[PDB]
Design a protein around this ligand. Structure first.
Ligand SMILES: CC(=O)N[C@@H]1[C@@H](O)[C@H](O[C@@H]2O[C@H](CO)[C@@H](O[C@@H]3O[C@H](CO)[C@@H](O[C@H]4O[C@H](CO)[C@@H](O)[C@H](O)[C@H]4NC(C)=O)[C@H](O)[C@H]3NC(C)=O)[C@H](O)[C@H]2NC(C)=O)[C@@H](CO)O[C@H]1O
Length: 410
């Protein structure tokens, strides 16, 4: 029984072209659904205005660093349809409670953080009392919403490299002292959260999981894994976003294998191996698959061959499924295929698919059945814990999940 996990983005239902809800999740093919994202009462200056307003609203009457539902309309209020369970809310959470009823062996986790809401962790990590309050209140939150099976932490990232903590910019790069403080704080956080969950177990007699995302390369090495790992169930390795429309460097976003043609030698295999070397047990590690792609326009010096280690484009694509530069899998299948002038290609050495439009000079890197099969099989051979996807709505048919399930649970 390997992990076959999917993230469920709380916001995706709002796209009329793919209004994906909890009722669309292929629950019988997953071991875990992870609800993205919750946060805490702390600074969100780097998030959208929408998110900052939602947070400020929820902060009313709560202590600093209290675990919160952010989009409460999505989570609790919007009617996604009647359910058999008698719960005093609607939203996605009523649907998750129903899903748990119909699929009792599925594990459902809330994820705290994510790219745009990691910022408050940096403030929380400065004080033990802040971390205690977040731990206490996060466990109270799942105790109240008792279809949840534990807690996932998606703090991008202790030691920096996230949205408000870029090392490439002088005034956001974290100091050595702050990196060190955050290293110790992450251990304390997971120790405290694990203890709080163990107390909940003593009350309810259920087992709870505590898991975390892990960034790649230097972003993994900001945590003391030898100290932290005993507290954690799974580490979800974010083996994606290697390249993107933020830079002119063009190539694979989530390639399984590093090659001599990779930009900067990147590939999921090399990053997973580093994580194991840092002291994450392979059997706790879960490789990441993407149900989206990224793309570039005005790709230079390229005729449709294999991508190389110096491939560049004018810029990231000024087009996307919603925000520019990324594409959900379903949008790629519908709108960026052969009939639209995009040639599907597969880099066998990398195990990664890409799309090349020769007339328009557009390059897209993504993930498909072939690469997911390859990643699941590699995970098995590397004695990993399983595979997960960011995020389920990219695959409305459930066809990519089916590959994850069949190939991992094999
Ligand atoms: C730990 C870590 O770094 N995890 C990574 C993921 O965070 C990351 O995926 C990105 O996650 C962002 C949130 O952290 C996503 O931001 C969402 O962006 C959409 C626009 O795409 C916003 O949109 C809807 O939101 C409200 C709520 O219903 C709705 O009313 C609005 O009309 C609608 N907005 C628009 C313009 O459509 C969301 O509010 C926002 N969410 C948050 C919490 O800020 C971002 O989309 C997502 N990027 C992806 C999927 O490519 C993944 C992938 O990079 O990597 C993990 O490592």
């Amino acid at each position: 029984q390997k992990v076959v996990a999917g993230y469920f983005a709380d916001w995706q239902y709002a796209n009329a072209e793919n209004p994906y809800t909890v009722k669309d999740i292929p629950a019988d093919k997953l071991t875990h659904v992870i609800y993205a994202f919750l946060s805490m009462c702390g600074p969100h200056t780097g998030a959208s205005e929408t998110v900052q307003n939602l947070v400020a609203k929820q902060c009313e009457g709560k202590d600093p660093y209290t675990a919160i539902i952010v989009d409460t309309e999505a989570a609790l209020e919007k009617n996604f349809g009647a359910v058999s369970v008698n719960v005093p809310y609607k939203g996605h959470f009523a649907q998750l409670a129903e899903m748990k009823k119909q699929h009792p062996d599925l594990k459902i986790l809330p994820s705290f953080g994510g790219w745009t809401m990691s910022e408050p962790f940096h403030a929380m990590a400065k004080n033990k009392q802040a971390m205690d309050q977040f731990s206490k209140s996060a466990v109270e939150l799942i105790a109240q919403y008792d279809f949840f099976d534990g807690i996932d932490l998606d703090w991008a990232y202790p030691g920096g490299g996230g949205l408000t903590t870029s090392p490439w910019n002088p005034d956001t790069k974290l100091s050595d002292e702050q990196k060190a403080s955050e290293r110790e704080a992450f251990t304390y956080l997971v120790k405290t959260m694990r203890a709080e969950l163990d107390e909940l177990t003593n009350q309810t007699k259920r087992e709870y999981e505590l898991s975390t995302a892990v960034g790649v390369g230097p972003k993994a090495a900001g945590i003391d894994w030898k100290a932290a790992e005993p507290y954690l169930t799974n580490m979800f390795a974010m083996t994606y976003d290697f390249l993107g429309g933020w830079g002119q460097q063009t190539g694979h976003t989530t390639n399984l294998h590093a090659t001599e043609r990779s930009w900067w030698g990147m590939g999921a295999d090399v990053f997973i191996n580093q994580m194991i070397e840092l002291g994450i047990p392979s059997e706790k590690l879960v490789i990441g698959a993407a149900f989206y792609g990224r793309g570039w326009q005005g790709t230079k010096d390229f005729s449709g061959g294999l991508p190389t280690q110096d491939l560049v484009s004018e810029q990231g694509a000024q087009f996307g499924t919603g925000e520019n530069g990324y594409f959900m899998f379903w949008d790629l299948v519908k709108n960026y295929g052969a009939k639209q002038g995009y040639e599907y290609k597969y880099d066998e050495q990398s195990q990664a698919p890409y799309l090349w439009n020769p007339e328009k000079k557009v390059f897209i890197s993504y993930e498909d059945q072939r690469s997911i099969k390859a990643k699941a099989n590699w995970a098995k051979q590397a004695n990993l814990g399983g595979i997960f996807t960011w995020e389920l709505s990219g695959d409305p048919k459930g066809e990519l999940v089916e590959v994850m399930y069949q190939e991992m649970q094999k």
